[PDB]
């Protein structure tokens, strides 16, 4: 309950924003790797959608951080 913590809420949203994309890219990396298989040929499509969905975390989280400032 202060201003300092507030900034922490922002620095957090910004951290999970850029970090999030990385967490989604990391998972997407391994996800797409499994698709590399023959029986997992269709998995590629699943990895492609999972990647984009992960990109939706950039703006999503970005909104969170912004919301924090507003005071949540």
From Swiss-Prot:
Site (Reversibly protonated during proton transport): 56
Membrane topology summary: Multi-pass membrane protein
Function: F(1)F(0) ATP synthase produces ATP from ADP in the presence of a proton or sodium gradient. F-type ATPases consist of two structural domains, F(1) containing the extramembraneous catalytic core and F(0) containing the membrane proton channel, linked together by a central stalk and a peripheral stalk. During catalysis, ATP synthesis in the catalytic domain of F(1) is coupled via a rotary mechanism of the central stalk subunits to proton translocation.
Positions of post-translational N-formylmethionine modification: 1
Top-level taxon: Bacteria
Similarity annotation: Belongs to the ATPase C chain family.
GO molecular function, one term: proton-transporting ATP synthase activity, rotational mechanism
Annotated Gene Ontology cellular component terms: plasma membrane; proton-transporting ATP synthase complex; proton-transporting two-sector ATPase complex, proton-transporting domain
InterPro entries: ATP_synth_csu_bac/chlpt, ATP_synth_F0_csu, ATP_synth_F0_csu_DDCD_BS, ATP_synth_F0_csu_sf, ATPase_proteolipid_c-like_dom, F/V-ATP_Csub_sf
Location in the cell: Cell membrane
TM stretches of this protein: 1-21, 48-68
Keywords linked to the UniProt accession: ATP synthesis, Cell membrane, CF(0), Formylation, Hydrogen ion transport, Ion transport, Lipid-binding, Membrane, Transmembrane, Transmembrane helix, Transport
A Pfam family hit: ATP-synt_C
Subunit structure: F-type ATPases have 2 components, F(1) - the catalytic core - and F(0) - the membrane proton channel. F(1) has five subunits: alpha(3), beta(3), gamma(1), delta(1), epsilon(1). F(0) has three main subunits: a(1), b(2) and c(10). The alpha and beta chains form an alternating ring which encloses part of the gamma chain. F(1) is attached to F(0) by a central stalk formed by the gamma and epsilon chains, while a peripheral stalk is formed by the delta and b chains.
Disulfide bonds listed in the record: none
Note: Dicyclohexylcarbodiimide (DCDD) binding to the active aspartate residue inhibits ATPase in vitro. Fusion proteins corresponding to c(2), c(5) and c(10) permit ATP synthesis in reconstitution experiments with F(1) and in the absence of F(1) function as a proton channel; other fusions of c(3) to c(14) do not.
Record has Amino-acid biosynthesis as a keyword: no
CDD domains recorded: ATP-synt_Fo_c_ATPE (cd18185)
Name this polypeptide is given: ATP synthase subunit c
